[PDB]
Design a protein around this nucleic acid. Structure first.
Ligand SMILES: [Mg+2]
Ligand SMILES: [Mg+2]
Ligand SMILES: [Mg+2]
Ligand SMILES: [Zn+2]
Ligand SMILES: [Zn+2]
Lengths: 908, 114, 63, 106
RNA sequence: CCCCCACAUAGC
RNA sequence: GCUAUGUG
């Protein structure tokens, strides 16, 4: 008992051996490692430490531990020399240096350390797997965020089912903030002591103390430089998952004190942002611009926006949004927006403002009518308790209470279908897709799903690498600003948004403005910020789910300029065949087979893996939408300067990201996420999809043991990946090409908007060298605030059966002609429900039903090749109904089935 | 031209929407600003006369606006009217816990600045 | 059998919506609740019980 | 406008469930429910009976049948605010017409 | 009364 | 040029 009598020392603590006594215990903790051998953020075995738990007087166990590491004599003398230069810092754990005769061997005894370091909590939240949460459960239990019976409820981890888990993590937040303050004090002591080293997360206790001084080097005092890039960068998602700076809203940053009564007219907060940065991120080496209008390039906009996401959670929500000013026209006081305050981009002031103008021509009154300033100033104050979202104004004295009408019934096709032996009890095909009617609160209950959007920081070094790899997926296209005469608009008889939908459709605004007026409007948006208002419309579709669908029709003053900004790149993406993004590719004439053989290219051990995003429209963070818009604007180095590109980014982020959305005659603010009526929503969704897949591969490659990797090219790739993320701040433009070639060889993808199917290497994913479904689940947990259910996302082992689900189409291999052709077939319930239920009763006229049913039969031809017989009889029923209708009132004529098999033959 | 017609329509709606503003508390907080500009989110919060609260159930009613006066946005509000979702006029005496399943929720109360 | 229950509940709610019952919110809310839980139903029993509820709502007024 | 009711009644006759045809042929005689029929046990139901032969068929002693379910009679209003007992009305004193009965699910 | 963006397809 | 349907 002599060694246990020695470890207590003069601290006077009652101790019990946690492991076997007078020998080291073997634990399995997460580490942050960078040597010449192995680099990454993974879990390892720590076998050089013997640990003792401290007991209270009532002998229940205490969280304080005595971690004794016995090492070489060199590290002993070195850490004694350095700890004597650091024992006066408060944020350094107590070290007792002694020697003992187990044969003497040097011993380093640390005092009152915690069972789990900061890296354990960071790895447990960033690599989350259900049924493997024992470290996270132990941390959540021992810090009274919740008791042990909280986990007996299942779906407790889910942010969508159980939103009390954010309230659980907010109790870890203040311990995280105290750890941040102790980190800043430790960096101050390191600089004033003349010590140069790197701060890693696994050397920090959950109390905030720091305890491992082996790798540190002395310098002259006052000249020490600590390295905190990997520390803050890996810690950044935890700061907004646990809401670490929520104590800064109080009067002297104390939780047992009331809130700060900020002035309502205050909007700047720039000194507050700089003061917060110097309080918590003092030794972060890159410069922080609070307003991102002073940012050099887009890789600085991402940096300062990622800091503004965290810092804008302190400031009150009334200070954000447009900045209005009194402006006279012929001596008549108006109120128009001469700026915008962004949660992400800081304060942005318009450049071209006319305080006095005698006349108001068409362009400036279009800008003044699209502004939310006049509407939100003239309207009544609104307090909507149905919604968690911040409500600003109500434009009427009434409240709109629109409902969803049920779908009309086609009795004739149902009688024809029961005449042909369908819908017998026990057949595999039945009705499962109907028009679901909704009550009056449907629009506001669907708008309340924007509560899933939470302010989310990103790993900014990891995100800055991932944006460079995602830009490689968009290399073969070209883009740039086109003129107003070069635009191509599909349907002019669509609504122009609020408030423009009163006076006419978008045809009136494209026929009333000349090309010079549209080009002047685009040139205005390149130098000013126009905020707009998007109306929430209820979508009228047929579905299997009970939920309502809401689209966000953006006004004409945003889409008219977004078309000229993005149209060349979007048309180039839609025109290119064979690439990763498959927008614009037909599924007809062998296009489905061509896409599947494009994915199935050279992957050695191919499986097929497909996933889905839970609430992709709502839970999309603002950093990833900003990154998608920056990637799509990276095609503008010739036609736009840096200021023009930032003002276009600010215009788009003020029009489709933090817009003033009018849901039923009363304005609300939108917390974030994509908009369905954006001019570029599919392509930004594709950028976000490629971003999540690339960062899942990065998290897969960095969180494996580099020693256990058999290959040495892959191990060197991992060691270079950690360096390109967390060491160099330049973009290593040839390692980016190497990682892009590695992902093209082993993780080949097909990406439409949010649906995706990959063809990955089985032996690499089973070794943990590319992404699997587990890494996708972890990435969507920490970067998307959702839980991707494993029961939805699928894995396919056999190649000759294609992907299970892509664009809601199932695929089957068939012999067409003489060669084996993949064909897409839908679910027969969807085609049958589209046949027997129509959206309007005027569409049950025969001159429209012949067109509707020939289109439904073109979509339903590849069911005849299916082995199930009633699936094959679906198309025969549709064809016989078209025969009946056509006989009521030749391969190019549409009542004989070779017309429908010509749509899937590859020769056109 | 029809561009003249739509620009006349937008001109009249701008002219009506500026008369709807009354410039007293607007001019006070605009001219009290330092740079001359204020956030839009505090313009109806400190300028508007009417307030409309939409209350979904009865337990929300007893916390936010119960009685004839209530305090929201650091001001006193006097309840002018209470109208249910069918646009009918509802009295204050109808709102009770025993009568609450008979009421057509949500209620849309209308308050004026004191 | 059960498919005709869903196909007649959709046209029953269509007749109700044409008889201007959507002006009354308190009635239309439970009508669409009954109709949605008819279409989501997988058994004949609860479908026919909610069917007699919706038909009693129709036969309440004259029409 | 009018044909959608005829199509609904056609497929209602094609359904041929006992509760549905029971309710529609009671509605053919003038027996009309005044509220939404509940399916929870022990919930209130309002229904009217227009004549005495409808009382002969529909009302059954102390517990009357409706929608192929039995309902316990509690209280009757003859639309004149006269609370009618169960022992009061018989065929000897059938002039009192239609009378509103509350009920509970068995 | 409201009914978005993008792509594919069919008939004139 | 109009209409319709599928997909996100
Ligand atoms: Mg360590
Ligand atoms: Mg999705
Ligand atoms: Mg999908
Ligand atoms: Zn910057
Ligand atoms: Zn440009």
């Amino acid at each position: 008992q002599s060694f246990l009598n020695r470890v207590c020392g003069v601290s006077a603590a009652r101790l019990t051996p946690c492991g076997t006594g007078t020998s080291t215990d073997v634990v399995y903790r997460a580490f942050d490692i960078y040597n010449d051998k192995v680099a990454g953020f993974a879990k390892f075995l720590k076998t050089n430490c013997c640990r003792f738990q401290e007991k209270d007087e009532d002998d229940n166990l205490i969280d304080s531990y005595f971690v004794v590491k016995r090492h070489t004599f060199s590290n002993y003398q070195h850490e004694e020399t350095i700890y004597n230069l650091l024992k006066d810092c408060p944020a350094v754990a107590k070290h007792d240096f002694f020697k003992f005769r187990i044969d003497m061997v040097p011993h380093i005894s640390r005092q009152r350390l915690t069972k789990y370091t900061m890296a354990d909590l960071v790895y447990a939240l960033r690599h989350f797997d259900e049924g493997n949460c024992d470290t996270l459960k132990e941390i959540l239990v021992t810090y009274n965020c919740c008791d042990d019976d909280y986990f007996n409820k299942k779906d407790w981890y889910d942010f969508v089912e159980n939103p009390d888990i954010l309230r659980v993590y907010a109790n870890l937040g203040e311990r995280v903030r105290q750890a941040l303050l102790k980190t800043v004090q430790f960096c101050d002591a390191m600089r004033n002591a003349g010590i140069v080293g790197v701060l890693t997360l696994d050397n920090q206790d959950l109390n905030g103390n720091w305890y491992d001084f082996g790798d540190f080097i002395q310098t002259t005092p006052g000249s020490g430089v600590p390295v905190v890039d990997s520390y803050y960068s890996l810690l950044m998602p935890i700061l907004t998952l646990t809401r670490a700076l929520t104590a800064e809203s109080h009067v002297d940053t104390d939780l047992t004190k009331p809130y700060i009564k900020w002035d309502l007219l205050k909007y700047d907060f720039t000194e507050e942002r700089l003061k917060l940065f110097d309080r918590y991120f003092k030794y972060w080496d890159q410069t922080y611009h609070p307003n991102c209008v002073n940012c050099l390039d887009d890789r600085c906009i991402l940096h300062c926006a990622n800091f503004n996401v965290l810092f804008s959670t302190v400031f009150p929500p009334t200070s954000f949004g447009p900045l209005v000013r009194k402006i006279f026209v012929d001596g008549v006081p108006f109120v128009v927006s001469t700026g915008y305050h962004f949660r992400e981009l800081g304060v942005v002031h318009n450049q071209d403002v006319n305080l006095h103008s005698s006349r108001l021509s068409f362009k400036e009154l279009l800008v003044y009518a699209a502004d939310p300033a006049m509407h939100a100033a003239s309207g009544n104050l609104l307090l909507d308790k149905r919604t968690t979202c911040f409500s600003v104004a109500a434009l009427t004295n009434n409240v709109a209470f629109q409902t969803v009408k049920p779908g009309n019934f086609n009795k004739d096709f149902y009688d024809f279908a029961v005449s042909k032996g369908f819908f017998k009890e026990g057949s595999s095909v039945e009705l499962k897709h109907f028009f679901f009617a909704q009550d009056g609160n449907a629009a506001i209950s669907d708008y309340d799903y924007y509560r899933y959007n939470l302010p989310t920081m990103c790993d900014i070094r990891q995100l800055l690498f991932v944006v460079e790899v995602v830009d490689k997926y968009f290399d073969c296209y070209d883009g740039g600003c086109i003129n107003a005469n070069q635009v191509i608009v599909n349907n002019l008889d669509k609504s122009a948004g609020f408030p423009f939908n009163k006076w006419g459709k978008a045809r009136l605004y494209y026929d009333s403005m000349s090309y010079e007026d549209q080009d002047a409007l685009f040139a205005y948006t390149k130098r000013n910020v126009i905020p707009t208002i998007t109306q929430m419309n209820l979508k009228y579709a047929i579905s299997a789910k009970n939920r309502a669908r809401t689209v966000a029709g953006v006004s004409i003053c945003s889409t008219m300029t977004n078309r000229q900004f993005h149209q060349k790149l979007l048309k180039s993406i839609a025109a290119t065949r064979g690439a990763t993004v498959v927008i614009g590719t037909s599924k007809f004439y062998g296009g489905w087979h061509n896409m599947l053989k494009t994915v199935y290219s050279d992957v050695e051990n191919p499986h097929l893996m497909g996933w889905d995003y839970p609430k992709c429209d709502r839970a999309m963070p603002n950093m990833l939408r900003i990154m998608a818009s920056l990637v799509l604007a990276r095609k503008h180095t010739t036609c736009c300067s840096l200021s023009h590109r930032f003002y276009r980014l600010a215009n788009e982020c003020a029009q489709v990201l933090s817009e003033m959305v009018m849901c039923g005659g009363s304005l609300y603010v939108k917390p974030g996420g994509t908009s369905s009526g954006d001019a570029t929503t599919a392509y930004a969704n594709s950028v976000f999809n490629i971003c999540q897949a690339v960062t899942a591969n990065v998290n897969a490659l960095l969180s494996t043991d580099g020693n256990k990797i058999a290959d040495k090219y892959v191990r060197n790739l991992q060691h270079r990946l950690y360096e390109c993320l967390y060491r160099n701040r330049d973009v290593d433009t040839d390692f980016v090409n190497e990682f892009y070639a590695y992902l093209r060889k082993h993780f080949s993808m097909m990406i439409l908007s949010d649906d995706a199917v990959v063809c990955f290497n089985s032996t690499y994913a089973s070794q943990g060298l590319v992404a699997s479904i587990k890494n996708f689940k972890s990435v969507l947990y920490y970067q998307n605030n959702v839980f991707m259910s494993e029961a939805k996302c699928w894995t396919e082992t056999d190649l000759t059966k294609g992907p299970h689900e892509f664009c809601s189409q199932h695929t089957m291999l068939v012999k067409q002609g003489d060669d084996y052709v993949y064909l897409p077939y839908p679910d027969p319930s969807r085609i049958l429900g589209a046949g027997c239920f129509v959206d309007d009763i005027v569409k049950t006229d025969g001159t429209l039903m012949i067109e509707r049913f020939v289109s439904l039969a073109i979509d339903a031809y590849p069911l005849t090749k299916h082995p199930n017989q009633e699936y094959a009889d679906v198309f025969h029923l549709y064809l016989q109904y078209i025969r009946k209708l056509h006989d009521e009132l030749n391969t190019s004529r549409y009542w004989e089935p070779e017309f429908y098999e010509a749509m899937y033959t590859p020769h056109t | 031209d029809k561009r003249a017609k739509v620009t006349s329509a937008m001109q009249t709606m701008l002219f009506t929407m500026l008369r709807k503003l009354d410039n007293d508390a607007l001019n006070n907080i605009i001219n009290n600003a330092r740079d001359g500009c204020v956030p839009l989110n505090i313009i109806p919060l400190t300028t508007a006369a009417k307030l409309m609260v939409v209350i979904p159930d009865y337990n929300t009613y007893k916390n936010t606006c119960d009685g004839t006066t209530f305090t929201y946005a650091s001001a006193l509000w006097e309840i002018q009217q209470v109208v249910d979702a069918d646009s009918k006029i509802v009295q204050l005496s109808e709102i009770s816990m025993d009568n609450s399943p008979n009421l057509a929720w949500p209620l849309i109360v209308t308050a004026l600045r004191a | 059998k059960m498919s005709d229950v869903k196909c007649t509940s959709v046209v029953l709610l269509s007749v109700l919506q044409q008889l201007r019952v959507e002006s009354s919110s308190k009635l239309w809310a439970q009508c669409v609740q009954l109709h949605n839980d008819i279409l989501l139903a997988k058994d004949t029993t609860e479908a026919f019980e909610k069917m007699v509820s919706l038909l009693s709502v129709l036969l309440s007024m004259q029409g």
